[PDB]
Symmetry: D2
Subunit: 344 residues, 4 copies
Amino acid sequence: RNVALITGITGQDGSYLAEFLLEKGYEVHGIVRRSSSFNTGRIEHLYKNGNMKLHYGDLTDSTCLVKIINEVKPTEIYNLGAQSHVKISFDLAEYTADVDGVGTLRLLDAVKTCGLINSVKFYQASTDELYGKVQEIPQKETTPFYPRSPYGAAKLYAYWIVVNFREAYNLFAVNGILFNHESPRRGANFVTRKISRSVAKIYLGQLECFSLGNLDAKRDWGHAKDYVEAMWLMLQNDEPEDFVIATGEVHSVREFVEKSFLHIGKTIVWEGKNENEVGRCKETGKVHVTVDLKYYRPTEVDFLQGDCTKAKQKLNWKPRVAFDELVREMVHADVELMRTNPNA
Amino acid sequence: RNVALITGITGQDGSYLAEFLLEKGYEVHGIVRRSSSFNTGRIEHLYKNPQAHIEGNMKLHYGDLTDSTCLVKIINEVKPTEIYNLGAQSHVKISFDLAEYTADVDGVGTLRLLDAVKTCGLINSVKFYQASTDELYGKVQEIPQKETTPFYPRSPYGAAKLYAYWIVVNFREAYNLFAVNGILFNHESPRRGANFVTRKISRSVAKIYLGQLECFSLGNLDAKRDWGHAKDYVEAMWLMLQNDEPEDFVIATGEVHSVREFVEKSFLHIGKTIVWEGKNENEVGRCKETGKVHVTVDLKYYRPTEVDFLQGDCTKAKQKLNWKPRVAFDELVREMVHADVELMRTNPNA
Amino acid sequence: RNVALITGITGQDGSYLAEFLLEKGYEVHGIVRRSSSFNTGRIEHLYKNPQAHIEGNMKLHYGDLTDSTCLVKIINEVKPTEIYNLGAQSHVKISFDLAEYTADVDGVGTLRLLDAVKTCGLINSVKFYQASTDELYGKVQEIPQKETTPFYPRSPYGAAKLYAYWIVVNFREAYNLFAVNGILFNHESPRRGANFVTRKISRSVAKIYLGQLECFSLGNLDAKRDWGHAKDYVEAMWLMLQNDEPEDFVIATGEVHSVREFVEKSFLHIGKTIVWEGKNENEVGRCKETGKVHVTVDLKYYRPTEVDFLQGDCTKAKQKLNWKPRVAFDELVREMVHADVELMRTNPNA
Amino acid sequence: RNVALITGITGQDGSYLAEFLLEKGYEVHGIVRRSSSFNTGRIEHLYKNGNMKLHYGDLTDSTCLVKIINEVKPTEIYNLGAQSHVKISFDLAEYTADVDGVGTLRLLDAVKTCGLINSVKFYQASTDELYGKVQEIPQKETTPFYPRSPYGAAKLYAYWIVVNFREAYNLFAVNGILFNHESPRRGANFVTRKISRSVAKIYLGQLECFSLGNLDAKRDWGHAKDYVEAMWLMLQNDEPEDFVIATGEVHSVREFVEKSFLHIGKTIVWEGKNENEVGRCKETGKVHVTVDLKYYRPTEVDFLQGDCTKAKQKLNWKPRVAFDELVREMVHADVELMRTNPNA
Ligand SMILES: Nc1nc2c(ncn2[C@@H]2O[C@H](COP(=O)(O)OP(=O)(O)O[C@H]3O[C@H](CO)[C@@H](O)[C@H](O)[C@@H]3O)[C@@H](O)[C@H]2O)c(=O)[nH]1
Ligand SMILES: Nc1nc2c(ncn2[C@@H]2O[C@H](COP(=O)(O)OP(=O)(O)O[C@H]3O[C@H](CO)[C@@H](O)[C@H](O)[C@@H]3O)[C@@H](O)[C@H]2O)c(=O)[nH]1
Ligand SMILES: Nc1nc2c(ncn2[C@@H]2O[C@H](COP(=O)(O)OP(=O)(O)O[C@H]3O[C@H](CO)[C@@H](O)[C@H](O)[C@@H]3O)[C@@H](O)[C@H]2O)c(=O)[nH]1
Ligand SMILES: Nc1nc2c(ncn2[C@@H]2O[C@H](COP(=O)(O)OP(=O)(O)O[C@H]3O[C@H](CO)[C@@H](O)[C@H](O)[C@@H]3O)[C@@H](O)[C@H]2O)c(=O)[nH]1
C-alpha cells in the first residue's frame, strides 16, 4: 500500500512528482487551491478524462488539512506548496511567512492530530536560499545558514520545525535542500524561463526587447525532472536524513542569456554599465536586452554552488541533465510553444 | 481625476468592471494573487493588444486580502477615489469545506480593507463598494426580497458575507465613510467560472455538440434562481458610487427560472430536445432525436443546505439610479451556449 | 457522566459557571491563556482550599481561540458533554481600536471551536452554548426586544458576535448539532471587570469612602441599560442546555436604569447625596453634605456610536425554562458597593 | 527628544526597562493586552496616581500596531513582547509562531509603513535558545544556531527577519542575544522562581513538597535588572551590531535547588534515579522535592554558557550580580512576600 499526498501539486515539481509516483503505481493525492479560473494546467493530462485525486485546500486553513489527511491516510507526504518567488516575498512578506513558515507547522501538527506520527514519511522542500550570504564554498549539509529575504527566513523556520518534529516525536521527516531546478514548466517569472520565452518570441518576430536585473548573479542550475526523483529516494532511505541536491556547476545570469540567444543564431555583446547596460546582437545591431533596477533585490544572493557528495554516496543519486542541455531544451520548447500559439 | 482600486479583478465581475471604467477614462488598478501559473486570462486583452484609447490606464499589484501590510502599501501608493471590493472565495458549496478560509477572506478581509482606508487618512476622500449577495437572504423572510427584508444566511459563505455587510455599514455610520452594499442576485456570462451551474451546463452542451463529450451530471435539478448578465450588473456598481448619498440597493431581474429549464433551453440551441425519465437520483435526460442520454444526477453536487425562493425587487434601484437590466433569460442562455461552442471549437480544453 | 469544557473560565461569567456546575457534580475543564502574571484570581478559590465536595473536579488547559490545533487537542482529550463558549474580547469601546483582533476571537474563534467538534466526531454527542449579547440589537428595531426582533449591530463587537450567532445556527441546521444562543443583556456582580461602567462606579465610590480617592470621571451619564446579576444568568445557560430541543433565548430583567441613577444610588450607600450642576461636558456631581465634587465628565469615555433603548422580553425563557431573575437593581448596587468597600478596606489596590 | 515604545511592558524585562528609561527622563510608551482582570502588577507603581503611557494592543493585530507607532513616533523601539515559556510552546506552537515569529515582522513592517525607517532604533529580544544543541562551548556571536523547540524556531525566524531589515533598508536594528536572566519579578512558571517560591513557603509552613523535571540541565543565570541596561547600551552604539549578554558561569538546576534550601537551613541529599529521584532534608528526614516526567521537554537544551567578550569591549558592559547573590535575593524576597501574604 503506497499512498502519497502532495501539497502544491499544481506547481512545477508537483506535476513531475505526480507522474513519477503514478508510474510506480502509487495512489497520488493533491491539494489544490480554489481559483476563479483554471489553475491545473500542468497536471490536467493525468485525468484519463483515476489514480490521482485532487482536494480543495490551503496551507493556512487548519481544519481542512486535518480533514484531508484523515480522509486519505497517506504513507508519504510531500510538502511542496509555498509562495516560491524570492522577489515577490519582499512586498508580500507576511503572506509568505504565513504559508511557507507557519504552513509547514500546520501540516506537521495535522499529522500528529490524526495519530499518524509513526506511520507516515514526510518530505520538506527546503532550498539553497538558506545559505544566502554563503559561509562556505561550496555549500554542504553542515554549512551555516544566513538567509537574505523574507522567503529565506520563512524557509529557515520551516527547516527547523521539521527537525524538531523528527527529534521530539521520532517522525520520519527530512529536509531536501535542493538548489535551483528549471524546466519547460518553470514559472514564467523566474530568470531562466523569462529568458527562454523572450528569446523564443524574438526569433519568431513576436518581441524585440526584454528587461532583467542583476546580470552578474551566479546560480547552480539543474533539471526539475531529475530532482523530484531525489525526493522519493530520500523517503526510501533507512534513516531520515537531510540532503543537498545540486549539480556542482556555476554559471551567471549573463551566460544564460548568451547561450539562449546563441540557439537562435544571435551573438550578444554588452555595452554600458550597471542599470544602463544593454545587450546588442552582433549580427544585426538590434538591442534585445536592457537592465532595470526594479528587478534587483534589496539584499541579493550573489553566489551559489552545491556539493551533493552525501547524496551521491548514501542514495546513489546523480544529476543526468547539465547546464548546456538545459538551456537548449528550454529555448527549443518555448519556440514550439510560441510558434503554435503566440498568446502562450 | 478618477482612479479605481479593484480587488478580485481577475474574476468575472472584475474583468467587466475594468472594461467599463477604462472606457470612461478612469485609471484602473487591480490586486492579483501570486500564482504558479498564469491567472489573468480574463483581463489579458486589456494590457496586451489594447485599443489606442486606454492603453496605459491599467496597473496590477501583487496582494492578498489576508495580508494587512500589502493592502496599506497599495492603498497609500495608489490613493484611489473609488474602491470596489470584489475579491472573495465565491463558491457556496466549497465554503462548507473551506469555512475558515472563507471567513478570513470574505469577512475579516473586508475589515482589513476598510482599516487600510482609515490608516491612510482617506476616510473622507474615497468611495467604497462592497460586493454583497442575495445569499444573505438564505431562508427568505419575504417574497420577493427588497432592501428592508431581514437577513438569515444558510452557509459559511452567507455568514461571512453577513459580517462584511454590517462592518461596511458600521464604517458608514461611525466615521461617515461613503460606503455601499450591492445586494446582487445571481449574474452569469461567457466568463463565469466553470464550477457554477450555468457555465457548467453551457460548456458541457457545447462539448457534446462537437463530439468531445457524451454525458454530464448535475445535483438538484429543481433548484430555481434569479439570473442576470454580469455586464449589466457591473454598471449598477458604478451608478451606486455616483449617487448623491451612500445607499444599499438590490440588483436583480425579478424573473426566476429552474436549472432544469436552463438545461432544456441550452440543449435546444444545439438541435436536441430533452425528455426526463426516471425519478430522484436515477433521473436522466435523454435526447428525443437520437435516444442518447446526456444528463444524469449525482448526489455529490448537493449541499448541506439549500436556498429557496429567490426573487429580487429592485424598484429602489430603478427610481434612484435609473438602472434596469438589458439582458433576459432567453438571450443569456443563447449567448453562453453560442460562446462556448466557438471557444471549444477552436480549442478543446477551455 | 457530566463533563464541561468552558472557554473564558477566568472571566466573570465563567468563574460563576464553574462554581454552579461543580456544585452539581460536573467535571469541569477550562481553557486559560498563557500570561506573564497570574490571571486566575476569580477561580483560585476552587482548586486551592476547596470544599470536600468537588475537590479534584476542575482541570485547566493552556489554549487560545486563535490556535486551531490546541482546540482540537483539548476537545479530543476531554471529550465533553457540554461546551460553553464564553471566551471573547468583551469590551465594546476597546473593539473600535482592536477591531481585527476582536473579529478573530469573537467571530472566527467560534467557528474554530465548532470545527473542532466536527473534526473529533462529537457532533452528535455534545451540547454547545454560545454567549450572545443584546449588543446584536444595536439600533433597536422593536421595544422591547425578543427572540424574533431583527438584528442591527452598531460596533465591531456587535458585528463579530453577529457572525458567531449565525455560524452557530448554521451548524445547528446543517449538521443537527445541539447548539443554542444565549441572548443575554448586561449582567454585573462583585467580579465584573473594572473597565465596565458599574464596577467602575462601585470601586471608585468605595475608594472615596475610605479616603483613598477624591474624584472620578465618566462619559455619557444619560445612557440606560437593562441590568441583572451574573450569578442568576449563568443558571439560564445551564437550563438552555437541559432543554429537550435547542432554542435561542433572551435573558434580561426587563427593567431599565440610567448610569446617572446608578451613581446616585451608589453614593447613597456611602452616606452622600449627589446633586448635579453644570451642563454637558462641564456637568459635575457634588455631595450635598460636604460640598465636595466627586464626579466629572470626560469626553474620552464616549464611543463612536451608542446603543439606545435596551429592554429585554424573556417571556419565552419563563415558559420553556421556568427561569426568572432573583436579584433586582437596588440589591445589585447595594451588593456591589458593599463588596468593594470590604475589598478595598483590607487592601488598597483592587 | 527621547521617546521609547516597549512591547511586553507588563513582563519582567519590560517593567525594569521602563524604570531605567524613565529615570533617564525618557517618555516611555507601552503596549498592553486587554485582560478580563488586572495584568499590570509589575508597573502600576509607575503611575503617580505621567511620563508613562499605556496603549491597548497585540502583536497579531496589524492595524493597531500602525496606529500606535504613528501616534507615538518613537525614537527607540524595544520588542520584548512574546510567548516566552519554552515548555508551553510545545503544546502552543501555532500561537507561539504567530506572536514570536510573525509578530516581529508585523512590527518592522509598521515602522516602514509609517515612514520611520531612517529615524527609529529597534531592539529585538533574542535569546540563547537559538543555540539549542550547542555547536561550540562557550557560545559567542558567531556560533551556529540549532534551536530545540517551537519557541526556538520562532525566535530564529525573528532574528533573521531583523537582520534582513537592517541589511536591506539600513534600519538601525539589533539582536540582543541574552542568556537567562531572573529576578524577584520572574514568572512563577520558570524553574528559578518555582524553586524560590516553593522553598520560601516550606520555610513558613505553607507547603511541604514540590515537583520538578530534568534536574541535570545547566544554565547561565544573570540578573534581569543588569541586562535591561545592556539593551539600552546597544542602541547607543554607533553601528547597529548583535551582542551576546551572559555571565559566563554555569550551574545545574540541581545546584539551584540545593543553594536555595541552604538559605532556609536545610541540606538536601538525593536518593533514587530518574523520575523516581527525590530530595530529602538531611536534618529532618522530610522529603521536599520529587521528580515528574510532565515537566520534561521532548527535546532538551542540556548545556548553555555565554561568552560576552564582544559586549565587554565595545559597550563597556559587565554583569554586576553573580549566581550566589541571585539565589539569596530571590529566596529572601519570596519569604517576605509569602510572610505578609500567603496567597502570593
Ligand atoms: N526572477 C528574476 N530574477 C532575475 C532577473 N534579473 C536577474 N535576476 C537574478 O536571477 C537570479 C535567479 O533568480 P530566480 O530565477 O528568480 O530564482 P532564485 O532567487 O534563485 O529562486 C529560486 O531558487 C530557489 C532554489 O530552487 C527556490 O527556493 C526559489 O523558490 C526559486 O525557485 C537572482 O540572483 C535574481 O536576482 C529578472 O528579471 N527576474
Ligand atoms: N455549481 C453547481 N450548482 C449546481 C449543480 N447542480 C445543481 N446546482 C444548483 O445550482 C444552483 C446555483 O449554483 P451556483 O450557480 O453554482 O451558485 P449560487 O449558490 O447560485 O452562487 C452564486 O450566487 C451568489 C449570488 O448570486 C454568489 O455569492 C456566489 O458567488 C455565486 O456567484 C444551486 O441551487 C445549486 O444547488 C452542479 O453540478 N454545480
Ligand atoms: N465602560 C464605561 N462605560 C461608560 C462610562 N461612562 C459611561 N458609560 C456607558 O455605560 C454603558 C455600559 O458600558 P459597559 O457597561 O461599559 O458596556 P456595554 O457597552 O454596556 O457592554 C456589556 O454589555 C454587553 C452585553 O451586556 C457585553 O457583550 C459586553 O461584553 C459588556 O458586558 C454604555 O452606555 C457606556 O457608554 C465609563 O467611564 N466607562
Ligand atoms: N520551567 C521549568 N523548568 C524546569 C523544571 N524542572 C526542570 N526544568 C529545567 O530548567 C531549565 C530552565 O528552565 P526555565 O527556567 O523554564 O527556562 P528556559 O527554558 O532556560 O527559558 C528561559 O530562557 C531563555 C533565555 O532567557 C528565554 O528565551 C526564555 O523565554 C525563558 O525565559 C530547563 O532545562 C528545564 O528543562 C520545572 O519544573 N519547570
